Ligand code: HEM
């Protein structure tokens with residue numbers, strides 16, 4: 001039989017410090033039932049990995065939030081990629097893979113790296129800065145909207161829209177209800193920018209539209225795929241970079257190793273994604289009765305995957321609660337796993353790498369010098385404010 005737990009993984013108490021409850025979730029069994037929301041939960045690495053890698057049994061087209069699209073109306077038209085299963089998923093996935101391809105990274109790296117170096121030089125002139133607003137947020141804002149081909153006007157709607165998207169995967173708690181209440185202006189802005197004439201030549205948005213000539217997607221699919229990048233492409237990186245800086249600030253020995261070998265920048269970022277898991281949770285819906293970790297789950301049930309917990313599971317990781325920039329990080333599930341594994345992962349890693357490279361070369365110490373404030377969101381883990389003093393190398 002499956003253990004029933006009263007833990008609310010979407011409560012502010014949980015967000016404030018999820019680690020003890022995540023252990024309780026892992027140790028109760030391979031599959032638990034969360035009475036608060038009437039969903040199954042898997043918090044160990046093995047089951048999270050298994051669920052992610054069986055999209056046939058554990059589907060996405062009934063939503064990857066708590067809401068079951070078979071029962072309730074989606075809050076916005078479903079994503080053609082995140083909220084689709086093969087074979088409908090396959091061609092939109094291929095388009096985004098090509099738009100954000102290894103070859104595409106060559107076209108943006110120079111500019112992304114220059115912007116990272118410039119940002120760190122700017123911050124060093126101030127010394128004492130907020131590593132969230134002034135760095136984790138400022139840097140992606142300085143490169144990603146431009147890479148998308150967005151106009152300047154209205155960009156202030158991007159972070160609010162993303163906060164909404166990520167809150168909306170949650171249960172109908174206050175965070176979700178308030179986000180949806182306030183959604184109209186952000187939706188209006190984002191939806192408008194997804195149209196072809198509003199996306200600058202050569203940018204990711206224009207490229208998605210260009211693919212409508214190939215037979216991979218129709219012209220009416222392009223705006224929703226642009227919408228995907230404007231939903232997933234900014235706030236994720238904000239929280240990833242924030243995570244990495246927060247790790248370096250707390251683990252000075254690791255900052256020193258990074259300074260000594262800046263080639264560790266990419267793995268130092270990857271390890272931060274594992275360690276903090278800025279994207280904490282996703283759901284699937286079962287398409288049949290299924291046996292998972294000795295437990296039987298009926299058809300049409302929501303299954304909550306704890307990515308952050310999987311990334312700290314001692315059954316998989318040695319010293320999971322240590323930040324180690326030379327850890328073998330391959331296998332972590334912070335970007336997911338399988339057919340939906342983050343299609344933007346090369347952009348995320350590029351941003352993280354060039355920022356950590358800039359810090360590695362320019363900064364001697366990162367010392368927290370004010371109160372740290374956490375930001376609460378149904379799906380994202382990260383900080384509201386991280387006051388630090390940056391000492392120049
Ligand atoms: C550190 C930064 C990021 C993290 C931690 C992250 C995390 C994730 C995760 C866990 C998934 C899997 C969702 C699932 O299995 O249902 C995912 C998918 C996705 N991500 Fe990322 N992401 C990041 C950055 C980005 C960026 C920069 C972009 C685009 C520029 C992006 C676009 C997408 C899209 C479109 C999907 C859906 C892919 C599919 O359904 O096939 N993400 N991401």
Ligand SMILES: CCCc1ccc(C(=O)O)cc1
Nearest residue numbers: 079082227228231232236279
């Ligand atoms: C971690 C990224 C989560 C995510 C992925 C895809 C979408 C979308 O296609 O709209 C929105 C959010």
Ligand SMILES: [Cl-]
Nearest residue numbers: 076077187191
């Ligand atoms: Cl929308």
